[PDB]
Design an enzyme around this catalytic site. Structure first.
Site, PDB file in Angstrom:
ATOM      1  N   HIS A 288      -1.477   0.244   7.783  1.00 42.08           N
ATOM      2  CA  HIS A 288      -2.336  -0.788   7.583  1.00 42.08           C
ATOM      3  C   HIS A 288      -3.365  -1.184   8.505  1.00 42.08           C
ATOM      4  O   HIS A 288      -3.514  -2.089   9.246  1.00 42.08           O
ATOM      5  CB  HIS A 288      -1.331  -2.213   7.231  1.00 42.08           C
ATOM      6  CG  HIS A 288       0.052  -1.959   6.662  1.00 42.08           C
ATOM      7  ND1 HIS A 288       0.087  -1.329   5.560  1.00 42.08           N
ATOM      8  CD2 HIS A 288       1.075  -2.056   7.233  1.00 42.08           C
ATOM      9  CE1 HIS A 288       1.272  -1.277   5.060  1.00 42.08           C
ATOM     10  NE2 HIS A 288       1.791  -1.749   6.023  1.00 42.08           N
ATOM     11  N   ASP A 430      -8.540   5.251  -3.854  1.00 39.98           N
ATOM     12  CA  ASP A 430      -7.666   4.382  -4.621  1.00 39.98           C
ATOM     13  C   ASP A 430      -8.118   4.187  -6.081  1.00 39.98           C
ATOM     14  O   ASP A 430      -9.391   3.571  -6.215  1.00 39.98           O
ATOM     15  CB  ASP A 430      -7.889   3.036  -3.963  1.00 39.98           C
ATOM     16  CG  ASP A 430      -7.848   3.345  -2.359  1.00 39.98           C
ATOM     17  OD1 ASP A 430      -8.700   3.241  -1.803  1.00 39.98           O
ATOM     18  OD2 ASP A 430      -6.640   3.147  -1.743  1.00 39.98           O
ATOM     19  N   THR A 516      -2.682   2.364  -9.376  1.00 43.07           N
ATOM     20  CA  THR A 516      -3.996   1.890  -9.638  1.00 43.07           C
ATOM     21  C   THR A 516      -4.071   0.446  -9.451  1.00 43.07           C
ATOM     22  O   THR A 516      -3.592  -0.455  -9.935  1.00 43.07           O
ATOM     23  CB  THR A 516      -4.198   1.929 -11.155  1.00 43.07           C
ATOM     24  OG1 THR A 516      -2.708   1.601 -11.752  1.00 43.07           O
ATOM     25  CG2 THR A 516      -4.286   3.307 -11.749  1.00 43.07           C
TER      26      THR A 516
END
Ligand SMILES: [Ca+2]
Ligand SMILES: [Ca+2]
Ligand SMILES: [Ca+2]
Ligand SMILES: [Mg+2]
Lengths: 735, 146
Positions: A288, A430, A516
């Site tokens: 992160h 992504d 997704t």
């Protein structure tokens, strides 16, 4: 797109049996050339003059050159073409003739001709050599130097070789030519006068009917779609802001086609495009960390957070580092930090991109340092030579936003594990969503279970049996330890996207790590641009959060591909408390639906928790309990609406019997809305629930014998003491 | 671990159907409490839940009895959504309403031949308000209702 609008059906046949007699004459496709240019043909009564509801000043008569040769007396006409944008052909008739001297029906031909003409093979593509050489049949091809029927004034110019040496000039002239030629071949009498007094133009209008008209009836039809479509900048024009890696996208271009499923990705930061092609593994879920966009570090996830975008935010940068530290303390052996090593290219790139300036040199302890420049004003950077590592320190006259001041240290980035090696981390792919073809998911299901469901009696269960399948194998999204939260096929697809980009030239493991983003219910995000690798290669990048949403509605949703949109859309996303809007059909048609028992009880439950006052309080006021008991009734009438045993009835019935259950409820509502003091918060809800019921009933009604308006039908009910004959009344009330 | 929202409802509805307003409901009543809330258990599976904990008037379940009995079928069932997505799927045009047209259509794509008869047929037996078309609401029922 009705092309022929018949105004007045006044006259019996004859008018009709005269218009038709006219249209069956004109080629079924000369029309399609017409009903394509957006035209419409108007057949009216005796509007003759400017009397037509479309003949008024718009784009009328500027320069005269009318009827076949000439005339101009408007008041004496019946056929006219509203020449300007969408060709409007308007015509009429009075008393019963047209034949005898067809010298009249020949204008409804050219008068028409001037429709397709100017946009016919004579100019749209341009005056194509087909006609550029057909206009030369002036006096060069055959011994037929005859055209004393289209070239009298504007072309008695025989002493002028007509090619690209003046044809551009009088385009309109060669129109009176494509017209009075069209008019003859198709005229109801003189068809050979264009086969005798003309050498080729017959053979032309002929090839025209041969197929010429079906031609432009397809280049106008095709342009029909491609024209007014949805801007998308396909080709490598978008693949450029897609950030994806060309050799990769191009690699991905093979799977879509194979499995037949759209593939949409968010935007892959440019300052990572090449790091990816380089061999830099991607940022999975475990990290992160914040990317960065300046200095050597650019595109890398500095272990130092005050070296990533957030330069200054003494907190996000603070609680920022804090994230990597754990990113490691939690997932060690896989996540860690390795020193920044900018290879060869990477430099020449952060060069003309403007992130770094490579100049002066220097010596320290014994090695070479070219130094790296960047207008960052608290950090200085330098890169070695032996091993192009990189280093920085707090400029001699400043401090670290947090509160640090250090001298030259090797710059560490975050790196995951990749075959026993800590490779530096950068942006991943992504996927924004995977759209398999409904037909594909069929292949997902195992014949055994599917067959056991179609071999069923109850037809209605044969659906429930099916949809559950369509859900089971194609919509269900379980969570996963590693690859985030995703579907089952979604996974496979996700492995075949990597094994695809690795059997090419990648050496950083996989590049698509999680699921997704349409499952990022947690911290959902909205990106204007969206890269989409169609089911057949076509690269595309939307521009609006709409264009995207529109593009998907067009050739995805309403096109047989299975797509599901982010649960957290339309609601408030907890993680980031973000409101992301997305057209939902079910919600589109709420306005007209009687709500459920539970959807009602639900809504109360919601306002209770806010103004901490329920529809009914816990007391003794036989006034309050009155209200309580009362909802318990609306909570029935509504429940009673959606009664599963409503089938043993028949359509016309169903509607009615419910239109009542509905009314029954709209009543008890209007009932409380008048009672005691129910906080103005609930006042409205109910105010809203009414409109529903209403709209909902106006519907069931405008389905059968429609004229009666809810409001009215209402008044007419005796909701006093007895409810028995009431309904009996209602019946006739609708006959 | 029902969310609070999963409580306000569960109570806002547990009371609304509590005539003698104390804090416990009769058998017949519990049934009703559940229907309204969408659900609609069977005539005898309505016991195993209450029948399993009789520390009351032997046939009466309070609120902490009810709220802690909504897991036997709840923390497990998370299917509402699967179903609401399998809707927009059929709803092939964006009208929020399904139609024999699209049913049969999508029916075939998933590889299944439906007879133009047994479709203007499903739709029907699925439709409750007689408007010829199945909206989410009834779609839901048809599917979940057992
Ligand atoms: Ca009680
Ligand atoms: Ca629909
Ligand atoms: Ca319906
Ligand atoms: Mg990511």
């Amino acid at each position: 797109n009705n092309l022929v609008k018949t105004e007045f059906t006044n006259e019996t046949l004859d008018k009709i049996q005269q218009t038709q007699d006219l249209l069956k004459k004109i080629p079924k496709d000369v029309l399609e050339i017409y009903s394509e240019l957006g035209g419409e043909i108007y057949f009216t009564d005796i509007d003759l003059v400017e009397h037509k509801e479309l003949q008024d000043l718009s784009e009328e008569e500027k320069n005269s050159m009318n009827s076949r040769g000439e005339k101009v007396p408007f008041a004496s006409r019946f056929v006219f073409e509203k020449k300007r944008e969408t060709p409007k052909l308007i015509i009429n008739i009075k008393d019963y003739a047209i034949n005898s001297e067809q010298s009249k029906e020949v204008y409804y031909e050219i008068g028409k001709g001037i429709s397709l003409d100017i946009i016919s093979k004579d100019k749209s593509l341009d005056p194509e050599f087909l006609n550029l050489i057909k206009s030369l049949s002036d006096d060069s091809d055959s011994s037929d130097l005859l055209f004393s029927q289209k070239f009298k004034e504007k072309l008695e110019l025989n002493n002028k070789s007509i090619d690209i040496n003046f044809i551009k000039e009088n385009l309109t002239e060669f129109q009176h030519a494509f017209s009075l030629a069209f008019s003859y071949y198709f005229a109801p009498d003189h068809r050979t006068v264009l086969e005798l007094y003309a050498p080729d133009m017959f053979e032309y209008m002929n090839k025209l009917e041969k197929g010429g008209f079906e031609k432009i009836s397809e280049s106008l039809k095709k342009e029909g779609v491609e024209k007014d479509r949805i801007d998308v900048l396909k080709g490598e024009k978008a693949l450029k802001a897609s950030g994806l890696v060309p050799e990769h996208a191009d690699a991905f271009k093979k799977i879509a086609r194979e499995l037949n499923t759209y593939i949409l990705f968010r935007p892959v930061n440019k300052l990572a495009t090449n790091l990816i092609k380089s061999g830099v593994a991607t940022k999975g879920l475990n990290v992160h960390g914040k990317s960065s966009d300046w200095g050597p570090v650019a595109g890398y996830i500095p272990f130092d957070q005050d070296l990533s975008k957030k330069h200054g935010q003494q907190l996000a940068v603070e609680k920022g580092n804090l994230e990597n530290k754990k990113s490691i303390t939690e997932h060690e052996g896989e996540i860690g930090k390795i020193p920044l090593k900018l290879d060869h290219l990477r430099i020449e790139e952060l060069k003309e991109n403007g992130i770094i300036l490579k100049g002066k040199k220097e010596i320290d302890n014994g090695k070479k340092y070219y130094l790296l420049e960047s207008n960052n004003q608290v950090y200085e950077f330098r890169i070695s030579d032996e091993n192009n590592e990189v280093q920085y320190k707090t400029k001699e006259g400043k401090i670290t936003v947090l509160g640090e001041k250090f001298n030259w240290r090797n710059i560490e980035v975050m790196a995951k594990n990749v075959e026993g090696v800590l490779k530096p981390l950068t942006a991943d792919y992504d996927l924004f969503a995977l759209a398999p073809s409904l037909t594909e998911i069929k292949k997902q299901i195992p014949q055994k279970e599917w067959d056991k469901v179609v071999n069923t009696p109850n037809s209605l269960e044969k659906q429930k049996g099916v949809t559950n399948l369509l859900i089971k194998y194609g919509i269900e999204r379980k969570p996963d330890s590693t690859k985030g939260t995703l579907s089952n096929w979604q996974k496979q697809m996700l492995d075949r996207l990597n094994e695809a980009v690795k059997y090419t030239g990648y050496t950083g493991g996989d590049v698509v790590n999680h699921g997704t983003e349409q499952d990022n219910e947690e911290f959902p995000e909205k990106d204007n641009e969206i890269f989409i690798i169609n089911p057949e290669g076509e690269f595309i990048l939307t521009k609006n959060w709409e264009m995207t949403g529109r593009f998907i509605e067009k050739n995805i949703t309403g096109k047989d591909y299975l797509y599901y949109f982010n649960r957290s859309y339309n609601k408030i996303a907890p993680g980031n408390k973000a409101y992301i809007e997305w057209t939902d059909p079910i919600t589109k048609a709420k306005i007209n639906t009687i709500p459920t028992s539970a959807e009602f009880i639900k809504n109360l439950s919601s306002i209770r928790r806010s103004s901490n006052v329920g529809v009914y309080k816990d007391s003794g006021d036989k006034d309050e309990f009155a209200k309580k008991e009362s909802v318990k009734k609306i909570a029935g009438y509504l429940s009673d609406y959606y009664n599963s045993a409503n089938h043993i009835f028949s359509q016309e019935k169903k509607r009615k019997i419910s239109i009542f259950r509905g009314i029954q409820a709209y009543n008890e509502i209007e009932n409380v809305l008048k009672s005691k003091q129910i906080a103005p918060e609930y006042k409205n809800y109910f105010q809203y629930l009414k409109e529903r019921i209403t709209n909902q009933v106006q519907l069931l009604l405008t389905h059968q014998k429609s004229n009666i308006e809810f409001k009215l039908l209402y008044k007419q009910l005796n909701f006093t003491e007895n409810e028995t004959d009431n309904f009996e009344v209602f019946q006739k009330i609708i006959d | 671990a029902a969310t609070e929202e999963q409580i306000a409802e569960f109570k806002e509805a547990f009371s609304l159907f509590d005539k003698d307003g104390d804090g416990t409901i009769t058998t017949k009543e519990l049934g009703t409490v559940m229907r309204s809330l969408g659900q609609n258990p069977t005539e005898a599976e309505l016991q195993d839940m209450i029948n399993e904990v009789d520390a009351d008037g032997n046939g009466t379940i309070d609120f902490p009895e009810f709220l802690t009995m909504m897991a036997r079928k709840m923390k497990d069932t998370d299917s509402e959504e699967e179903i609401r997505e399998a809707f927009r799927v059929f709803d092939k045009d964006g009208n929020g309403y399904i139609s024999a047209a699209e049913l049969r259509h999508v029916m075939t794509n998933l590889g299944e031949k439906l007879t133009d008869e047994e479709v203007d047929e499903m739709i029907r037996e699925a439709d409750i308000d007689g408007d010829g078309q199945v909206n989410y609401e009834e779609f839901v029922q048809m599917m979940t209702a057992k």
